Amino acid sequence: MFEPMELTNDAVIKVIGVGGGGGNAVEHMVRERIEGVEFFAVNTDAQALRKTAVGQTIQIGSGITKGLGAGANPEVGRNAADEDREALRAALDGADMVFIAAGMGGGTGTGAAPVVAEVAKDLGILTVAVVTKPFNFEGKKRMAFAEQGITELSKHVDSLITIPNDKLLKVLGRGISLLDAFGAANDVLKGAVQGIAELITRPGLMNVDFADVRTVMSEMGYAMMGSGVASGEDRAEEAAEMAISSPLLEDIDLSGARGVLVNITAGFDLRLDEFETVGNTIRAFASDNATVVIGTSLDPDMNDELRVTVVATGIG
Amino acid sequence: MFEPMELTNDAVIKVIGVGGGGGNAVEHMVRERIEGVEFFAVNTDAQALRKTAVGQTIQIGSGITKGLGAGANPEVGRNAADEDREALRAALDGADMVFIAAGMGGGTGTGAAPVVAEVAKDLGILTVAVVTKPFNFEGKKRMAFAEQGITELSKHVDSLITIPNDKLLKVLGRGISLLDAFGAANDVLKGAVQGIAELITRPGLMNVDFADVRTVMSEMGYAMMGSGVASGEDRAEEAAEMAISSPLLEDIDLSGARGVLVNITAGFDLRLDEFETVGNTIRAFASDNATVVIGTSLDPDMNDELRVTVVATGIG
Amino acid sequence: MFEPMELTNDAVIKVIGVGGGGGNAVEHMVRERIEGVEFFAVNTDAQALRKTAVGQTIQIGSGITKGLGAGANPEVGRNAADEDREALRAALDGADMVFIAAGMGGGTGTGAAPVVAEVAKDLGILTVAVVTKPFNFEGKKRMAFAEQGITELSKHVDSLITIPNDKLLKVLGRGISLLDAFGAANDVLKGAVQGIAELITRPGLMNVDFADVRTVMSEMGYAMMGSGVASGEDRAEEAAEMAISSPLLEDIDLSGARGVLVNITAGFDLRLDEFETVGNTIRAFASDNATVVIGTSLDPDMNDELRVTVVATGIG
Amino acid sequence: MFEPMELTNDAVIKVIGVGGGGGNAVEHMVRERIEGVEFFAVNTDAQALRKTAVGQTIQIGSGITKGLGAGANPEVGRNAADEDREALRAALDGADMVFIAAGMGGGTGTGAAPVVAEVAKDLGILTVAVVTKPFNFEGKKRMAFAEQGITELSKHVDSLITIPNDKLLKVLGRGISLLDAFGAANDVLKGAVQGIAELITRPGLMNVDFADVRTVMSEMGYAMMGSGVASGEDRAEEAAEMAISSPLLEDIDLSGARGVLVNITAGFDLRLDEFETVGNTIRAFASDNATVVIGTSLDPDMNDELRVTVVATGIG
Amino acid sequence: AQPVDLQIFGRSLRVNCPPEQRDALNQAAEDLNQRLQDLKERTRVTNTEQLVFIAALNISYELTQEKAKTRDYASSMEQRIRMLQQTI
Amino acid sequence: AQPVDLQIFGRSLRVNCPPEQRDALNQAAEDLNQRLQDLKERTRVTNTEQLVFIAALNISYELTQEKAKTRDYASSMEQRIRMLQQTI
Amino acid sequence: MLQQTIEQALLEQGRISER
Amino acid sequence: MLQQTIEQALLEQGRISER
Amino acid sequence: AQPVDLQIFGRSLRVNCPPEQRDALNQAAEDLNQRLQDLKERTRVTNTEQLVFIAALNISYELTQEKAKTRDYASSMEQRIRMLQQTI
Ligand SMILES: Nc1nc2c(ncn2[C@@H]2O[C@H](COP(=O)(O)CP(=O)(O)OP(=O)(O)O)[C@@H](O)[C@H]2O)c(=O)[nH]1
Ligand SMILES: Nc1nc2c(ncn2[C@@H]2O[C@H](COP(=O)(O)CP(=O)(O)OP(=O)(O)O)[C@@H](O)[C@H]2O)c(=O)[nH]1
Ligand SMILES: Nc1nc2c(ncn2[C@@H]2O[C@H](COP(=O)(O)CP(=O)(O)OP(=O)(O)O)[C@@H](O)[C@H]2O)c(=O)[nH]1
Ligand SMILES: Nc1nc2c(ncn2[C@@H]2O[C@H](COP(=O)(O)CP(=O)(O)OP(=O)(O)O)[C@@H](O)[C@H]2O)c(=O)[nH]1
Ligand SMILES: [K+]
Ligand SMILES: [K+]
Ligand SMILES: [K+]
Ligand SMILES: [K+]
Ligand SMILES: [Mg+2]
Ligand SMILES: [Mg+2]
Ligand SMILES: [Mg+2]
Ligand SMILES: [Mg+2]
């Protein structure tokens, strides 16, 4: 059979929601219908697993908690993760790169995300962890547990994204619904996952592929990932500034990034000055020792739109 | 059977596009339908190889990158080239002169072009390499990798053509499309290849042939190749100054050339003063120790057009 | 049979390209695949009609020009339109509103657009004429013919959009291709047609329909129509200022508009302050005696993307 | 059978060489292989008719000269033309536009060209006459006969092109062959004919056709026709100034033209500024009361060339 | 010959056809539309600028496969019919 | 499945084919090359942007015209052979 | 009956051959 | 003789059917 | 294939010929030389730039006349020989 070619790469990307917060963040993407990504929910709470819209679930520590949450004990979460490490490895095997989502400060996520990260690293999988700090009013003990957990998580990941949960109150403005604030928080992980997937699979005139992703995230540190879209006369500048804007992320210094990966997607009318303006926006913060890779993907599907996807790692 | 004579020489000329940029430059010529030349695409990225309209492809380093790009690592490109040296030798064997095209700064092209050049040189093939520098906004490290790669490439090529990618922003003018800006750069390699082929094969009143090409390219250094076409009263002068105009090439000094090769093509009405004006244009920059060879080819096919092809090597 | 309800209105909209320029403008929309709209090409030149990608054609004046152009004679164009008025009426009958596109200055478009407009007005159809002035270098007589033709066209249309062809030179930038420069002008008519159709058919929370379109086009005058799309934090403001920006239109005074029709389309997360900012953008220029209608259409189909369509008539 | 469309117009163009000089000028085009045009040779001299490479011949006045020339008698030429008017009418019937070529001063051409022109005008055919004055050394009486003949010819031709034969001595240069000097003069008629044919038949983005030709030639007077071709950076300006350059024509004032017809042909990369520069070149001389028509024809066949064809009539 | 207009695979075409082949052209357009429509989702991202080329090579092979049978069964039946003619 | 190159009508294509249909692909390529060559020589100036579309509609009509004979003579010979079987 | 089957086969192959 | 021609015709129709 | 050199009608030519057709080429050269040499004085002053054209159309006509006989007498002998076979 004479078949047309398939110019789409093959990628295995896994998103794991550990604990209640991570389960919520993953369920956000599930309800938003993002294709090409495997969804998971790992928890100690049977009720939370049964409630989520995430299809595949992995109940950890059924023999230590009997289907109850860890009860704000990181040790219980770590023990429940250690008990079911085989199930984690089996469900996480054969993956190019995983995205671990976990709101941290409690028992399950805080003590269980480092174990999943360790499983992935031992398996030899690039790992990105997207976590949220507790609110200010949740106490000092909650924040201390979250910080210790984040240290343990950074011990076993390649790039870590931290969302202070207190920036929702400052950024989103009063009158915002709780559901909408949480959705704004979850959009960080959704945008990161979707941008990485589109960059890895879809081809381009100046191709950037999984190897570029591996070589920019080959060094531990904080990271920012996102995309921007614009139209009109100033579409290039607007899209570039949207891509590198992180209102909800922790106060981050892009100049300290040691790896920058940019992909520009537009129609065939992409002018050279627009490409130059995106490149100049990227160069505005990139350091002299950072590995900057700029990619372009002219797509007839994009009618008059310009999308810019920026991945910056190695920060701090 | 009584057959008319064939007054056309035989030449084997190969154009190899190493990496994404080189593949783009070669597929430009493929889409423009240039005859009498073999086309190749050498890469580590399977997706880019399957994308290109370049017909014959040589996937290098399938056992080190598993079909992915080099990830901006020159060492990975060199290793992937060394792994599959036999395929390069087999595809490049039996060639009079090769034209290696590679956009330099990344991993595949930067580290792989010197290996292909070494294969051609130890095989005993005259080699011309047409490469592009990275943009200004792509960083200092990208430019450093490209410069080191060009230093390595100079060791195994007889003549090297360098196109600073930053001159597209300065020469072409605002509003130019990315596709047309890149096509302007691709036309340098297209003009070089087509001019050299037409010079080598087709005969002439004052014949210049492959031996003249070999004796002008016996001196290592930078080079410029191109052609000009004109009509009307000032056809000779206009074509001569069009042939030695290189807006997109790096700032070059033609007076430093150690070898100049000129071929004038026109109809039988070519006047003596036109030939003299072309010769004076060439003498305006040719040095006293340079080997200048002037060729003429009166062709009834050229109705009222005058074409001048100039090859100058040994610069810098 | 258990039938799910259809919430889409029904509208008949016709786009007629009279002469070469109008045929080009309509063929642009045909190639861009705009749905729900009828396309026509009306001309005296048989070769141009057979060239265009516009499917259905209406060759006028086959008995006065014998399939040739009008030869820059407006009188010949008017006579050729009067000869085949029945074909125009038959193809234009049963229409809610027509969009006549023509490039004034020549013979066919200049003298034939007023006749088609007269046919539509006699039939009782809302008429919008999108025309282009000649270039500066095309002469004084060409511009005089175009101005006389536009004066005649103003008698039989409801709203007229004029695009000075000399603003392409000033706005687009030195280096833009002719095809892209002409596509920029064609996008004015494309945006007008697509915005009007999308407004008339699709429902909304604060519904605006064909009656509002009729009551804002109930007065002769210059008009501007277009749409703006944006995303991100400033999506409302960016889209609003994109909708009322007309770089290629003749120098226009929005404050003189006596009818403004605005439609905001977004997802269910559209905040109240975004709606207020769009309303304030509209109020910034709307006069006190103008009939302003603001519409909203929350669409689950639409992503975090926001679109604003503005129709302003009665100017000048 | 499903057949592809034919976008080429149909035109009948006749070139008649009356007398020895006209026969020479026509057989120049015959030997240069110009397609799509009918060739004729009208003469009184049987020997010259049997010499010429022109295929179709029309021996006039076989009953007054018995196959000999007119012997420098304009009256004999007029009588010989009047005798065989039916053959001229039959061969010249069914023609859109004729091009009468005749070297004036002698007997056959001088007295016979006005009769052929009268036949064409009575038949209702647009007529263009390309004639040459005698040399300086050929005498005062030869020049007087030629001037009287041109005065007669002006009565029945829509546009007349006059080539002073004395400008060959001043323009071409000492040492030019007689054959090449005469070929330079013949190229005026060849360029006029080929440019007009290519303009009338092949289509364009801004189509100009036979009607435009008729409306620019509706004004009696002198005319100039020609084409220019260029490549490179200044292709538009070079081609424009080449098209309106007439070294061999009589001292002419383009500002007095009452009709200008321009057609620009290039590839799809034709930039807007190139079109503007051609238009500015045309505007540099076009008067305010002249009908200027600018046409464009983007052709994939034109690889990187740019052709400009200019027809200016009504002069003097 | 009365040039007809078609809209195939989102790509307007203009062909002149004899009046008697009009309906054959319409059904050919439907067949081609369906063939290319099935060729679109065979691969998610491809060089769509080449898709009609495969849509023509596939039907070229599918035409040869059935074209060979034209002579195949014709020859077999012809030898059978002449031989039964000759016996009786 | 072992992607292979083609160069058809001055337009390079890449199609992956099973090993057993390779020669069929080559012959379809020559048939298409010849068909489009005959189409180009049919007209002086045309829209080459649509020429392969005509080259596919023509072969689809030429496919159906002879493909209907497949069941035509099939049904004829089936009925004849059933009736002959039933008699003897 | 077997004499005419081959005779009518000729007519049916006539309509095949013209087809 | 006529008995077997129809029998082999069945094999020929079978090879057509799989053809 | 070992390019040969000829001097025909005062006009040097270069042809490559198989070794076995050398003498045939020489005899064709003499025939052409004689044909054009006879064509020269057929007219005192002419367009000699066309003379080889008539020297080729004349032998084209002469080839047609005596080439049609190849099939003529072949057909006649065929009918006579088959008929004599069938009688005895
Ligand atoms: N942005 C969000 N933050 C959340 C969400 N749920 C929890 N959190 C934050 O994350 C912190 C961790 O709480 P979780 O309920 O996710 C703890 P988990 O269920 O993983 O552990 P145990 O229930 O203690 O076993 C919590 O203090 C909040 O500040 C959510 O849906 N969105
Ligand atoms: N003029 C052009 N320059 C290009 C093009 N593509 C890339 N480049 C330039 O060349 C530089 C090298 O980038 P490439 O993508 O060609 C590197 P390659 O694919 O050969 O190596 P890896 O992908 O890192 O394995 C890049 O930084 C650009 O400045 C192109 O199409 N045209
Ligand atoms: N933006 C564009 N303007 C155009 C285009 N074609 C023409 N024009 C402009 O419109 C003016 C009218 O030229 P047209 O060719 O449209 C005249 P038309 O064919 O309607 O009349 P005749 O050919 O004289 O019968 C012309 O002077 C240009 O300034 C086009 O494709 N785009
Ligand atoms: N540029 C050219 N001018 C020519 C040529 N032949 C003649 N002429 C010029 O035109 C003038 C007219 O001379 P011709 O011989 O053409 C006169 P014709 O044969 O038409 O008339 P009779 O022979 O007197 O019957 C003559 O005086 C020359 O000045 C020619 O081949 N080229
Ligand atoms: K990619
Ligand atoms: K040579
Ligand atoms: K509505
Ligand atoms: K035309
Ligand atoms: Mg819990
Ligand atoms: Mg690569
Ligand atoms: Mg027109
Ligand atoms: Mg004479």
Residue numbers in the entry:
A (entry chain A), B (entry chain B), C (entry chain F), D (entry chain E): 1 to 316
E (entry chain G), F (entry chain H), I (entry chain L): 3 to 90
G (entry chain I), H (entry chain J): 85 to 103
From the paper:
Cell division in most bacteria is regulated by the tubulin homolog FtsZ as well as ZapA, a FtsZ-associated protein. In the presence of GTP, FtsZ polymerizes into protofilaments, which further associate into a ring-like structure (the Z-ring). ZapA binds FtsZ straight protofilaments preferentially to crosslink FtsZ protofilaments; thereby, ZapA bundles more aligned and straight filaments constituting a coherent Z-ring. A FtsZ protofilament has polarity and lacks symmetry, while ZapA is in an equilibrium between homodimer and homotetramer, which are related by C2 and D2 symmetry, respectively.
In this study, we report the high-resolution cryo-EM structure of the K. pneumoniae ZapA-FtsZ complex. The cryo-EM structure of the ZapA-FtsZ complex reveals an asymmetric ladder-like architecture, in which the double antiparallel FtsZ protofilament on one side and a single protofilament on the other side are tethered by ZapA tetramers. After removing the duplicated particles, we performed helix refine with D1 symmetry, namely with a single C2 axis perpendicular to the helical axis but no rotational symmetry along the helical axis, and reached an overall map resolution of 2.73 Å with an optimized helical rise of 44.58 Å and a helical twist of −3.11°. The well-resolved FtsZ double protofilament structure enabled us to confirm that all FtsZ monomers are in the T conformation with GMPCPP bound and that the two FtsZ protofilaments are antiparallel. In the ZapA-FtsZ interface, the ZapA dimer head (chains G, H) interacted with two pairs of FtsZ dimers from two antiparallel protofilaments (chains A, B, and E, F). The N-terminal region of FtsZ (residues 1–10) was sandwiched between two ZapA molecules. The interface area of the ZapA dimer head (chains G, H) with two pairs of FtsZ dimers is extensive (2105.4 Å2) with a ΔG of dissociation of −17.0 kcal/mol, as compared with the interface area and a ΔG of dissociation between two FtsZ molecules within a FtsZ protofilament, which are 1390.6 Å2 and −16.0 kcal/mol, respectively. According to the PISA calculation, chain B and chains F and E form an interaction area of 523.4 Å2 with a ΔG of dissociation of −3.6 kcal/mol. This feature is rationalized by the electrostatic repulsions among Glu238 and Glu305 found in the inter-protofilament interactions. The entire structure of the FtsZ protofilament with ZapA was roughly similar to that without ZapA (r.m.s.d. = 1.53 Å among 918 Cα atoms for three KpFtsZ molecules within a protofilament), but ZapA binding induces structural changes in a FtsZ molecule as well as an adjacent FtsZ molecule. When comparing the structures of FtsZ within the ZapA-FtsZ complex and that of FtsZ straight protofilaments alone (PDB code: 8IBN15), approximately 2–3 Å shifts of the β2-α2 loop and the α1-β2 loop are observed (indicated by red and green arrows in Fig. 4).
